[PDB]
């Protein structure tokens, strides 16, 4: 009934709706239609690695911190329920998100110095402590 760009717009409204004001603790349930959601040999859609997850990378190839963080937010609330994701897919995805908020940081040095963001790294060690996410589901020994 639907195409792809349908669920492209319409996937991110009910991600905030049910993180911010849905008590997170009876999530237990969640995780069997979630994952068919997001399993590619669960639900017969033809899923790829890219537009599955391409409004999360519209704002990760060069939008500020501002919208990053609760970006990365929806990575946290997504990977505590058991989302399994390739490897290859979150380094480089986000090597381009550090690459870019790099430039926009270097962007912000040169705008104090035009004639010649800061506590997103608050944000990064949630970065980390999700990595830790993939490798508590992937890389176990």
Request: net charge negative; glycine share 2%.
């Amino acid at each position: 009934v639907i195409n792809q760009s349908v669920w492209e717009c319409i996937m991110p409204e009910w991600l905030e709706a049910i993180r911010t004001e849905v008590p997170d603790n009876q999530l237990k349930e969640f995780r069997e239609v979630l994952s068919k959601m997001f399993d590619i040999e669960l639900c017969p859609l033809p899923f790829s690695m890219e537009e599955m997850f391409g409004f999360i990378s519209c704002r990760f190839t060069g939008y500020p911190s501002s919208v990053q963080e609760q970006a990365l937010l929806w990575l946290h609330v997504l990977s505590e329920l058991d989302i399994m994701v390739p490897l290859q897919l979150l380094i480089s995805m986000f090597s381009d998100g550090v690459n870019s908020v790099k430039e926009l940081a270097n962007q912000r040095k040169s705008r104090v110095s035009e004639l010649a963001d800061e506590m997103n790294l608050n944000c990064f060690i949630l970065m980390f402590d999700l990595l830790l996410k993939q490798m508590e589901l992937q890389d176990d020994g």
